[PDB]
Amino acid sequence: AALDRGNEQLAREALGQRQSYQSHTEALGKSLGEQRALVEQVRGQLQKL
Amino acid sequence: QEAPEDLLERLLGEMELELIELRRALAQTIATFKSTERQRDAQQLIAQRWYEKAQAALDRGNEQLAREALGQRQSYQSHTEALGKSLGEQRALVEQVRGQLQKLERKYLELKSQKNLYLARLKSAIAAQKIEEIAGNLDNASASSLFERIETK
Amino acid sequence: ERKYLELKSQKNLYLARLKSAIAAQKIEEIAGNLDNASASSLFERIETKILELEAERELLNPPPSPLDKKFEQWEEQQAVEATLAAMKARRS
Amino acid sequence: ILELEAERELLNPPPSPLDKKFEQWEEQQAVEATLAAMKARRS
Amino acid sequence: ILELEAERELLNPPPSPLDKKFEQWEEQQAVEATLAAMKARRS
């Protein structure tokens, strides 16, 4: 709708708005991955005990 | 310096009260920043009123009073300029302060996200440091394990 | 009085900035940046210490030798293949 | 009383000034759209 | 207050002035890329 109504200037503003979240998604897009492989290692230790 | 894990838990506790203390202080500037801003308008308002009367000062053939009226406002004219720039300086400063605060909260939560993820690993080793000591492995027969001490006695 | 109020107007505006730095002086010290790995950050001290205990288990009672895994992995193939080998004949 | 006003405006920030445009700029489409079909629907 | 500002800027140095270019110079590609496909995607 930003560009559909001949308001592409707003679309650029809209497009730049999301980039803030794009970095945030990537920022937290990898923190989860690191935790995932770590806990499963912790799980293995507990079962043996 | 207590145990590294013990200090961390306490350290984060005092961090929470820190931000909210900073939370209150920043709000004070916003209130005062507005209060002075409003104060300026009222001060500018009253001074503007005097100029309005200047029409009647000269309308009734009393221009001598108009000069007195005109000189009266000049006192407020300087005052308006005096406070006309103090607000401008404060405006650009607080917004910089605002930027700093947001990162701390965003930073603060992410640090805490991994706080417990290490505590469990820490307690994995401590439990994974005792069982062997109690019994050990029969291949070596250390005899330091309390279990062996039972056998020898 | 005119001077007094204006001075006070800026009193708090500096206190918030002052408390910005003190809070902006601790977070890095607690954790720092992973690129440098200062190890002065309390967070790193946790990482190094946990490693030390890992050595005790791996050293006081050594884990199975790397060969030991082969002797058990190389033979499990015989076990799994043996059971299915008889399974095919047993099925027939 | 002003101090508390900041907490609401800061602790949970209000919608951005742009956000009002994204909703005000589109409500015109909604109101105009319904009446646009209304005229044709009437006919 | 200035003295503490140095610690953050020095103990953990901020991104290099170049680093801003590497991220600013590429964001233009990102923003232009999405709208470039948007025009074709719209058509």
Residue numbers in the entry:
A (entry chain J): 77 to 125
B (entry chain I): 22 to 174
C (entry chain H): 126 to 217
D (entry chain p), E (entry chain G): 175 to 217
Excerpt from the publication:
For our analyses, we refolded PspA in the presence of 50 nm sized small unilamellar EPL vesicles, similar to a recently described protocol. In the presence of EPL membranes, the rods had a wider diameter and a broader diameter distribution (200 to 345 Å) in comparison with the diameter values and distribution of the previously analyzed apo protein (180 to 290 Å). By segmenting the rods of the EPL-PspA sample and sorting the segments according to diameter through classification, we determined a total of 10 cryo-EM structures with resolutions ranging from 4.7 to 6.5 Å. While the imposed helical symmetry parameters suggested no architectural relationship between the PspA rods, helical lattice plots revealed that the left-handed helical rung corresponding to layer line ~110 Å in the power spectrum increased in Bessel order from n = 10, 11, 12…18 with increasing diameters of 200, 215, 235…345 Å, respectively. Upon insertion of an additional subunit into the helical rung, the assembly widens in discrete steps of around 20 Å up to a diameter of 345 Å. The rods with diameters larger than 280 Å were of particular interest as they showed enclosed double-layered lipid density in the cross-sectional top and side views in addition to the expected PspA protein densities, whereas rods of 270 Å diameter contained only partial lipid density and smaller diameters showed no density in the cross-section views. When comparing them with the previous apo structures, we observed that the structures of the EPL sample were identical to the apo structures with the same diameters, including their respective helical symmetry. The cryo-EM structures and MD simulations showed that only rods wider than 270 Å internalize and tubulate membranes. As indicated in the simulations, the energy required for membrane bending likely is too high for thinner rods to bend and internalize membrane tubules.
